[PDB]
Design a protein around this ligand. Structure first.
Ligand SMILES: *[C@@H]1O[C@H](CO)[C@@H](O[C@@H]2O[C@H](CO)[C@@H](O[C@@H]3O[C@H](CO[C@H]4O[C@H](CO)[C@@H](O)[C@H](O)[C@@H]4O)[C@@H](O)[C@H](O[C@H]4O[C@H](CO)[C@@H](O)[C@H](O)[C@@H]4O)[C@@H]3O)[C@H](O)[C@H]2NC(C)=O)[C@H](O)[C@H]1NC(C)=O
Ligand SMILES: *[C@@H]1O[C@H](CO)[C@@H](O[C@@H]2O[C@H](CO)[C@@H](O[C@@H]3O[C@H](CO[C@H]4O[C@H](CO)[C@@H](O)[C@H](O)[C@@H]4O)[C@@H](O)[C@H](O[C@H]4O[C@H](CO)[C@@H](O)[C@H](O)[C@@H]4O)[C@@H]3O)[C@H](O)[C@H]2NC(C)=O)[C@H](O)[C@H]1NC(C)=O
Ligand SMILES: *[C@@H]1O[C@H](CO[C@@H]2O[C@@H](C)[C@@H](O)[C@@H](O)[C@@H]2O)[C@@H](O[C@@H]2O[C@H](CO)[C@@H](O[C@@H]3O[C@H](CO)[C@@H](O)[C@H](O)[C@@H]3O)[C@H](O)[C@H]2NC(C)=O)[C@H](O)[C@H]1NC(C)=O
Ligand SMILES: *[C@@H]1O[C@H](CO[C@@H]2O[C@@H](C)[C@@H](O)[C@@H](O)[C@@H]2O)[C@@H](O[C@@H]2O[C@H](CO)[C@@H](O[C@@H]3O[C@H](CO)[C@@H](O)[C@H](O)[C@@H]3O)[C@H](O)[C@H]2NC(C)=O)[C@H](O)[C@H]1NC(C)=O
Ligand SMILES: *[C@@H]1O[C@H](CO)[C@@H](O[C@@H]2O[C@H](CO)[C@@H](O[C@@H]3O[C@H](CO)[C@@H](O)[C@H](O)[C@@H]3O)[C@H](O)[C@H]2NC(C)=O)[C@H](O)[C@H]1NC(C)=O
Ligand SMILES: *[C@@H]1O[C@H](CO)[C@@H](O[C@@H]2O[C@H](CO)[C@@H](O[C@@H]3O[C@H](CO)[C@@H](O)[C@H](O)[C@@H]3O)[C@H](O)[C@H]2NC(C)=O)[C@H](O)[C@H]1NC(C)=O
Ligand SMILES: *[C@@H]1O[C@H](CO)[C@@H](O[C@@H]2O[C@H](CO)[C@@H](O[C@@H]3O[C@H](CO)[C@@H](O)[C@H](O)[C@@H]3O)[C@H](O)[C@H]2NC(C)=O)[C@H](O)[C@H]1NC(C)=O
Ligand SMILES: *[C@@H]1O[C@H](CO)[C@@H](O[C@@H]2O[C@H](CO)[C@@H](O[C@@H]3O[C@H](CO)[C@@H](O)[C@H](O)[C@@H]3O)[C@H](O)[C@H]2NC(C)=O)[C@H](O)[C@H]1NC(C)=O
Ligand SMILES: *[C@@H]1O[C@H](CO)[C@@H](O[C@@H]2O[C@H](CO)[C@@H](O)[C@H](O)[C@H]2NC(C)=O)[C@H](O)[C@H]1NC(C)=O
Ligand SMILES: *[C@@H]1O[C@H](CO)[C@@H](O[C@@H]2O[C@H](CO)[C@@H](O)[C@H](O)[C@H]2NC(C)=O)[C@H](O)[C@H]1NC(C)=O
Ligand SMILES: *[C@@H]1O[C@H](CO)[C@@H](O)[C@H](O)[C@H]1NC(C)=O
Ligand SMILES: *[C@@H]1O[C@H](CO)[C@@H](O)[C@H](O)[C@H]1NC(C)=O
Ligand SMILES: *[C@@H]1O[C@H](CO)[C@@H](O)[C@H](O)[C@H]1NC(C)=O
Ligand SMILES: *[C@@H]1O[C@H](CO)[C@@H](O)[C@H](O)[C@H]1NC(C)=O
Ligand SMILES: [Ca+2]
Ligand SMILES: [Ca+2]
Ligand SMILES: [Cl-]
Ligand SMILES: [Cl-]
Ligand SMILES: [Zn+2]
Ligand SMILES: [Zn+2]
Ligand SMILES: [Zn+2]
Ligand SMILES: [Zn+2]
Lengths: 692, 692
């Protein structure tokens, strides 16, 4: 009963069967079908041999279209006649044309409204796109309906940016430039998005809050809810997503200013004029949204399975991923959920033969991830005291695939060594690498930008269920999946993301026919959990944090150094940060020596120092105006929730600082953030010093 | 080498010698004399045998009078002639008339100013005193100088209350009613305050922040400071303290309205008219303050001594008390500091014979307590991650005596059983109780109001160095000292509090000639530290928390039930709180069974559950507008920093609720606080459940 025993028990065929099982009907959060799947998973995890498996339910704000009053967009003429209407549903895929309860495309949490106005095209609606529009092109979005292409950043950031530009509505669409790979066919004949395809998704800006109505506290039976006007993160303008057939109709008539350059042009046979409004002949026509979706407090269900530790039952290693999907969830999340299911089954076989892991393993099937990480966050709010005193590590388990080229790992530096070592012991599933390790294929296909002979591992960003564990609670976290070639990655995900076309057949036919990439991902995620839950000494290397902290300090310093005059005027020094990083490096080196040179108390003392090291980067005061982003080293980018930002407090203080009215106040805040960062790094270092 | 060995080594004669040694010159925070005493203590603790003894220094905002521009108050006539001036200094006591660097009486952190106006007498300047003035008597304090008698509540609350009433200055004075015990002589012939005596003290409203310029972060070398206008807790009107000879001169001419009743009248031969202003003949005379004190960032020094644990070096039991005094500190703090010194010496003797405690003991000599708990708080801010993961308990050690009648203990419920047991094993020092236990004399003289055969133990309030450890960080905390008869206690402290007359001779002559009360307090504080640092199982009884939580829930419910109509209208239920308390009671009972029915891992797991139980009552979001008061069960009263309030969030939401303009919003907030309290109690209970 070792890791090899665990790993060998995992079967590609089982993952395939589970994926099929999980993807036959929609499992939208808050629906009966998803409660039924929750009860199924609970039953099976009990069968598989877990010690206890419970449902943890919460009543959270969700959002749904009105079934008898559909959402749509129009071009409207002078007289008020609707001369063009966008589609009410995606054409259903072959053999699903009679499946009921497919939620039509909508933007979750949009307010209701019927705004009419002139269109402005805002490219990807990124911060720099709005800078270009308002500063360089002098185009004013106030009272306009903005049309933006999906991609590059989380859609909630697009909506926030449009809102602050004064837009009265937002139309999101999938451009073939971003969601149609050259030379591959549209679904069902390949993996591309057809013109009638539409990406669902929420447009919240929760900043880690969880349920919009109950920030800080679980949405239990006696919870006291904020009123809707005080809710966290809701958009104040109507928003709706469309496909590129419909987008072409909205864009083809656009007049006003030309696109500023080619990076604003997608692939449609359209000028990509910015507007505002339409060309001469159509100048009196307007665009009208009709949004009637409702926000509703709705019950959600997490499945929580426990495999009690033999030696340290009060130490938790958590494998969690969500179960709710937009429609069938063929990739997102069921390709991940099937992998978790097989991992539970494998751990359970070992358990039935009398084995127990050293530490407690918790398994989670989260609900309502798609509506803002609501299930994971409410559960973590409920159990925060247990998690922060006992939480060793969190491994996420959403989609196992976003491509089929190579491995993707995003994790805390504390897990780098664990990942390098585990992947050296796993077989590559890649063509041309048969008989070679996963480590070998991965570093060959995804080389580190910094170190020869090492693979790329990214910072954790957000937009998934690790956010509460990592950035709020400071529990060492990681994720892994298969991905496309980093070199050709345009960072907008796979074409059928959150569409009705994301089905079992998509995966079985076009991504992973042999389920070998799924199996590899099961081995990586399960192998990580195994090592974290069983290794005598926690498998974290604090020295890996020391290396990246120096890299991040250099990076933030370099950003500041674009403003040498201001750094002189306001006496802005990074000396304290570099000093703290140097100290961390020295103390981490000494701690590592003791860790090899040392008695269960010294061990556990040692293990507690390892466990609480991620915890030490938490600031209980949070980051400015983002109280649930407490980690001082890593936060989701204020411009793109999906992206991780390092030294986020200093980064945001420096961002666009040349445009601040009061430079004294602005640079004062840069200095304050340097102080907080230097202090936190030093304090974290000191947790690794001898204890007395 | 057991507790008896430790206890027997403690000597009354040593405490006496140390008290004498610590009280010959003033030790004002931020002065050279107090840095010298810090270096002395450091040297002696090294000599006594501690493993390491370091100084931890910080640069914090302090406040001092201007030596060449003295503070004083005048009665000023029509022409602007100053016809009466208050005293510039307290007449120095016999044999100290040539001692230099006695800081004259002042209110630390007063702003500068010379306001002139009419006097209003506001009794003790409590919330209910201002309610009486403004609501019942229709007296408007706006633009008036208020005169208030010291006593009943922390002076900072008086100043806040006066400020919000619109006062333009505050004069604080010691009334003989509150600071002259009938039948005892004035210093030097007894322990009473003479008419020229004046009580120093800060008038901040920090609410746990520590250094006004650096809330959240230690005031280290690279700290970034708030500007003075954004500092925490500074008063916005000038304030000055005077003695009763001077107060009589200010009060004797007061006209306007009569005192509303006898509870407004002190003991001076004066009408206690409320004003505003003076009687007919003197109606054109005014009162003028002249305050020229300056706030200055100044270095302070804590002494931190470590005695490393043999078995759990990463578990800290902290004995801390301050060293800085207003003048000689004969009682406050040196009667406590001498006790700590002797405790260190006794632990050190044992250590030199080869003993070590099971857990690490930390000893602290804090600086700048008198200026707002600044030394303890900055150190805890620096070391917060170590303290919250490793902090077992904090025992405070300020003044060992406020009387000589019986024991006073204020502590967390987790220490009740420890205290009852320890005091049963100690000898009573009381006359008439020779050969009896301290427990016996204490419960006879200070009976519990609730339980026959038990002594009174109060809730922790604040106004001392345990505040950061208990209410911010959630470390189990306690204090103990000798006190006066509870039955005759008027709750304003001893007459010579913070006066020049608080000397070695005061204690040696009038409080504790034989130093037997000091020795008893050394045995209580040291005995507590010993048990906490050495007992195999931490000496906390979680069931004692269950009992008080029910008491507090009944109390808060009863307050709400004065508003039955509103509880009906707004559906205000305490059911969830009572449910959580019931659950806590049940789980605590089961945990206690396992604690006796159980392996060092199960033990330590068990010990961690005990250690983290106080920690579980912390809410990282803090209480409303008081982010550093995080404990949900106990906070300092919003009306009196010295007093502990239970369920403070709900208490403040209910306070004066009948006067709120918007009852819907007000009762909504009561419900929100009930939710937070019920959740926190349940979450704390669940930390005592089986871990997996
Ligand atoms: C990285 O780790 C190193 C430790 O190796 C830390 O070094 C400390 O750095 C600060 C400087 O920022 C030093 O602070 C200075 O302390 C002097 C007194 O120190 C005595 O006491 C301590 C223990 O209390 C002993 O360790 C020490 O050896 C001495 O016995 C003060 O006199 C200094 O203040 C004077 O100079 C400054 C600067 O010019 C003026 O602003 C002041 O007004 C004053 O005149 C100063 O405060 C500290 O001594 C160093 N410690 C050690 C052990 O060397 C780094 O701080 C750490 N980096 C971070 C970011 O934490
Ligand atoms: C003190 O400790 C007790 C445990 O002994 C807690 O009791 C829980 O109390 C809540 C009620 O507030 C119960 O919640 C209810 O759960 C039902 C489903 O429960 C099932 O699943 C759980 C595990 O997930 C099992 O433990 C349980 O036995 C069941 O199998 C829901 O159906 C209920 O909702 C319905 O009724 C309410 C109220 O009328 C409506 O508002 C809803 O719309 C809905 O129709 C309800 O949510 C919970 O089951 C109890 N747990 C147990 C183990 O008994 C107390 O909560 C605790 N006190 C505090 C303050 O925490
Ligand atoms: C675009 O859609 C609008 C609105 O139509 C409604 O919503 C759609 C998304 C679908 O769900 C439709 O089934 C649904 O009707 C169309 O305009 C609408 O046309 C209808 C029928 O022509 C109008 O109905 C009325 O009927 C009676 C007479 O029988 C009279 O009271 C009225 O005079 C009117 O004729 C309806 O008013 C009108 N609604 C709006 C808001 O304009 C529109 O035709 C369509 N455009 C296309 C297909 O190009
Ligand atoms: C109350 O105190 C005031 C102020 O006196 C000053 O502050 C005190 C607390 C002590 O530190 C004093 O030593 C200090 O002077 C007294 O009023 C002041 O009186 C003096 C002397 O009479 C005035 O000095 C001036 O001197 C020259 C002439 O030699 C001329 O320029 C002026 O015409 C004036 O006479 C001083 O102006 C005056 N100050 C104020 C603010 O009023 C006051 O007498 C005293 N009251 C008592 C003892 O009842
Ligand atoms: C996905 O897999 C699950 C688990 O295999 C399937 O659910 C299972 O379905 C079977 C057959 O429908 C159920 O067995 C039946 O039980 C009832 C008594 O409760 C009895 O009347 C029948 O004779 C039959 O034995 C079984 O309860 C159920 N198991 C669980 C744990 O839910 C499910 O059908 C699969 N879904 C798809 C879409 O393929
Ligand atoms: C990933 O694998 C590497 C390579 O096995 C691990 O590093 C190795 O860890 C071992 C065990 O602690 C080290 O052995 C030690 O060697 C020193 C002498 O150099 C000796 O004093 C100790 O008694 C012990 O035997 C070994 O040096 C070390 N190798 C390297 C190259 O660092 C690493 O720990 C693994 N990472 C994780 C997270 O498990
Ligand atoms: C309070 O007690 C302390 C500790 O006993 C006293 O401080 C100590 O004073 C002695 C005598 O003044 C010092 O010894 C001297 O040392 C110097 C060399 O440094 C030498 O020239 C002298 O011959 C003498 O031996 C001693 O250093 C000092 N100890 C410490 C730890 O500070 C202090 O005097 C007492 N204070 C009062 C007010 O009674
Ligand atoms: C304060 O002192 C009291 C009285 O000594 C302590 O309570 C006592 O603690 C002992 C040791 O855990 C208990 O003994 C146990 O008895 C049960 C059977 O009743 C047995 O199963 C266990 O093996 C064990 O021998 C004893 O019952 C208990 N007495 C009472 C009256 O509760 C208390 O723990 C002390 N408090 C602290 C904080 O140390
Ligand atoms: C979904 O849409 C329909 C409208 O097509 C809503 O039903 C109407 O609601 C209004 C306002 O409450 C009533 O005055 C009408 O009597 C209803 N009209 C019809 C034709 O039924 C319905 O409320 C919406 N559903 C939700 C959940 O908001
Ligand atoms: C203490 O008080 C004296 C005044 O009696 C202050 O000294 C004066 O300061 C002002 C304003 O800065 C100067 O214009 C004068 O030249 C000074 N006058 C005298 C008579 O010396 C002194 O600054 C105060 N000290 C502090 C620390 O504030
Ligand atoms: C944009 O338009 C609105 C409303 O017409 C106006 O109030 C606002 O100031 C404009 N902004 C700029 C930068 O021109
Ligand atoms: C899956 O792998 C093949 C290589 O055999 C590749 O050509 C194909 O495009 C991949 N599928 C996806 C969806 O990327
Ligand atoms: C008290 O006096 C001030 C200034 O004279 C006035 O503005 C204020 O409204 C008064 N308050 C009451 C309650 O009379
Ligand atoms: C100290 O004890 C005696 C009893 O012997 C008492 O009369 C005296 O008032 C006490 N001193 C103080 C300061 O309370
Ligand atoms: Ca919540
Ligand atoms: Ca501070
Ligand atoms: Cl993932
Ligand atoms: Cl005390
Ligand atoms: Zn998704
Ligand atoms: Zn997902
Ligand atoms: Zn004091
Ligand atoms: Zn004190």
């Amino acid at each position: 009963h070792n890791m090899k025993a665990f790993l060998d028990e995992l079967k590609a065929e089982n993952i395939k069967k589970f994926l099929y099982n999980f993807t036959q009907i929609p499992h939208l959060a808050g629906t009966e079908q998803n409660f039924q799947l929750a009860k199924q998973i609970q039953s099976q995890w009990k069968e598989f041999g877990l010690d206890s498996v419970e449902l943890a339910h919460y009543d959270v704000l969700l959002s749904y279209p009105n079934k008898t009053h559909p959402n749509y967009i129009s071009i409207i003429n002078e007289d008020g006649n609707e001369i063009f209407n966008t589609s009410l549903f995606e054409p259903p895929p072959p053999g699903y044309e009679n499946v009921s309860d497919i939620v039509p495309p909508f933007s979750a949490f949009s307010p209701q409204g019927m705004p009419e106005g002139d269109l402005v095209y805002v490219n990807y609606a990124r911060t720099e796109d709005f800078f270009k529009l308002e500063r360089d092109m002098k185009i004013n979005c106030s009272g306009k309906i903005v049309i933006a292409r999906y991609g590059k950043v989380f859609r909630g950031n697009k909506v926030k940016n449009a809102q602050l530009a004064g837009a009265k509505g937002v139309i999101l669409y999938s451009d073939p430039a971003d969601y149609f790979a050259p030379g591959v066919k549209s679904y069902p004949d390949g993996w591309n998005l057809p013109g009638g395809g539409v990406q669902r998704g929420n447009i919240l800006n929760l900043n880690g809050a969880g349920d919009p109505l109950t920030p800080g506290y679980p949405a239990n039976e006696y919870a006291y809810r904020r009123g809707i006007a005080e809710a966290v993160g809701l958009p104040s303008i109507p928003v709706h997503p469309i496909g590129y057939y419909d987008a072409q109709k909205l864009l083809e008539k656009m007049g006003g200013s030309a696109p500023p350059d080619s990076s604003w042009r997608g692939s449609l046979k359209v000028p990509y004029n910015v507007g505002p409004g339409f060309t001469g002949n159509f100048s009196t026509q307007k665009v009208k949204m009709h949004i009637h979706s409702t926000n509703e407090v709705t019950r959600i269900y997490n499945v929580i399975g426990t495999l009690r530790g033999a030696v340290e039952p009060d130490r938790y290693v958590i494998l969690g991923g969500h179960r709710d999907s937009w429609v069938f969830g063929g990739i997102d999340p069921q390709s991940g959920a099937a992998v978790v299911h097989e991992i539970v089954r494998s751990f359970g076989t070992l358990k039935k033969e009398g084995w127990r892991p050293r530490r407690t393993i918790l398994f989670a099937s989260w609900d309502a991830e798609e509506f803002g990480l609501l299930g994971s966050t409410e559960w973590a709010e409920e159990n925060s005291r247990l998690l922060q005193e006992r939480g060793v590590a969190y491994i996420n388990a959403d989609s196992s695939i976003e491509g089929n080229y190579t491995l993707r790992v995003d994790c805390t530096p504390l897990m780098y060594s664990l990942v390098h070592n585990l992947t050296k012991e796993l077989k590559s599933p890649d063509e041309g690498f048969e008989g070679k390790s996963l480590y070998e294929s991965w570093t060959k296909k995804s080389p580190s930008p910094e170190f020869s002979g090492m693979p790329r591992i990214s910072k954790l960003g957000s937009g998934n269920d690790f956010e509460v564990f990592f950035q709020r609670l400071g529990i060492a976290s990681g994720r892994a999946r298969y991905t496309k070639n980093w070199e050709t990655n345009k960072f907008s995900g796979y074409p059928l993301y959150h569409s009705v076309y994301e089905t079992y057949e998509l995966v079985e036919k076009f991504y992973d026919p042999m389920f070998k990439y799924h199996l590899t991902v099961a081995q990586v995620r399960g192998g990580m959990v195994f090592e974290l839950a069983n290794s005598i000494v926690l498998p974290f290397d604090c020295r890996d944090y020391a290396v990246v902290l120096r890299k991040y300090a250099d990076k933030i310093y370099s950003i500041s150094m674009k403003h040498p005059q201001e750094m002189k005027t306001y006496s802005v020094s990074f000396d304290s940060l570099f000093s703290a990083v140097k100290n961390f490096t020295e103390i981490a080196s000494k701690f590592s020596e003791r860790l090899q040179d040392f008695n269960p108390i010294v061990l556990r003392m040692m293990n507690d120092q390892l466990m609480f090291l991620e915890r030490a980067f938490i600031d209980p005061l949070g980051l400015p105006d983002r109280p649930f982003y407490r980690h001082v080293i890593y936060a989701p980018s204020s411009h793109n929730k999906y992206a991780g930002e390092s030294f986020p407090g200093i980064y945001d203080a420096l961002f666009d600082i040349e445009s601040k009215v009061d430079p004294s106040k602005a640079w004062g805040e840069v200095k304050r953030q340097i102080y907080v960062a230097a202090f936190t790094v030093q304090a974290a270092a000191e947790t690794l010093s001898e204890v007395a």
